[PDB]
Amino acid sequence: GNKICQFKLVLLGESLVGKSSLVLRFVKGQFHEFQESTIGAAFLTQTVCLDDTTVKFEIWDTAGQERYHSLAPMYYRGAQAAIVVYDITNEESFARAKNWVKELQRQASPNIVIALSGNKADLANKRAVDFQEAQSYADDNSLLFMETSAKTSMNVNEIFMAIAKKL
Ligand SMILES: Nc1nc2c(ncn2[C@@H]2O[C@H](COP(=O)(O)OP(=O)(O)NP(=O)(O)O)[C@@H](O)[C@H]2O)c(=O)[nH]1
Ligand SMILES: [Mg+2]
């Protein structure tokens, strides 16, 4: 197909849940066991083929540490989609993700497409967040949910493509 679409996507979530790893996996096909905490935000782009449309993602990978919270609107204002990420081995990171969802629903664009990534799914032997519980939470709040693993690549391209399809 010859159609071309471009959308702005932002990743939000508690520090260490794997936002930069998810983006690096999707954009560069890389995964680093040792990834330094992001300062402010990082920016990357990736273009994919969806049906007869070429979709380019402009991705803002935000730093999740609390000291950067006040910068968040600079990154999510104007975003057409967001991926809120938590770590399936850490319930507090899941609670933090719910508060990011609330902030987006109240302060971001009214028509933003919000996805929820239960990341580090490869560490299911240390699970702290029940899959069905997270799926129900996502369903009830109109969020596109998938468990992902930036480490193994599980559902990484899938979550970005599912978002593209809904934009
Ligand atoms: N097992 C596993 N480790 C992962 C996964 N995704 C990220 N990690 C690891 O978790 C750590 C932090 O990842 P990183 O992507 O930097 O997290 P972040 O959410 O960007 N942190 P910040 O918000 O501070 O920038 C790294 O050691 C990374 O290798 C995953 O899917 N599985
Ligand atoms: Mg990061």
Side-chain angles (χ1 to χ4, degrees):
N2 55 50
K3 284 174 73 291
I4 307 296
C5 295
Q6 178 166 302
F7 299 104
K8 180 181 170 173
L9 187 151
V10 62
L11 289 96
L12 297 159
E14 178 171 288
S15 179
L16 309 187
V17 299
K19 300 180 294 303
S20 296
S21 295
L22 277 168
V23 177
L24 287 167
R25 194 76 201 226
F26 178 59
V27 179
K28 307 189 178 183
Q30 309 178 341
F31 171 74
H32 307 138
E33 193 57 58
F34 319 102
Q35 190 72 47
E36 197 91 59
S37 181
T38 305
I39 299 170
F43 179 82
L44 305 76
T45 66
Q46 175 62 297
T47 300
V48 302
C49 173
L50 177 60
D51 296 305
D52 50 51
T53 297
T54 288
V55 179
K56 175 174 183 182
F57 275 122
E58 287 199 331
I59 311 173
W60 282 94
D61 171 23
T62 68
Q65 281 171 24
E66 183 58 43
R67 71 184 106 277
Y68 302 112
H69 193 174
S70 68
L71 303 176
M74 298 300 296
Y75 310 126
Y76 66 65
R77 178 176 292 118
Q80 288 115 308
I83 299 178
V84 179
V85 186
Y86 66 98
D87 167 356
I88 72 153
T89 72
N90 182 339
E91 181 179 68
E92 190 282 332
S93 76
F94 175 54
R96 178 69 188 86
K98 298 187 183 176
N99 292 319
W100 273 120
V101 169
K102 286 188 165 192
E103 174 165 348
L104 290 171
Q105 293 183 330
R106 299 176 203 166
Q107 301 173 55
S109 291
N111 299 126
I112 190 175
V113 169
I114 306 176
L116 181 73
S117 154
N119 197 48
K120 310 200 187 186
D122 55 287
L123 304 181
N125 63 170
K126 293 181 187 185
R127 178 179 297 279
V129 183
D130 181 87
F131 178 86
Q132 187 51 56
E133 178 179 315
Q135 181 71 69
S136 180
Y137 163 75
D139 287 346
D140 293 350
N141 287 277
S142 298
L143 312 178
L144 173 260
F145 177 60
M146 291 188 187
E147 277 192 354
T148 59
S149 176
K151 179 170 179 171
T152 75
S153 79
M154 186 184 82
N155 290 335
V156 171
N157 289 338
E158 287 81 350
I159 198 171
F160 281 95
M161 299 295 277
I163 288 168
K165 189 169 189 154
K166 288 293 182 175
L167 286 165

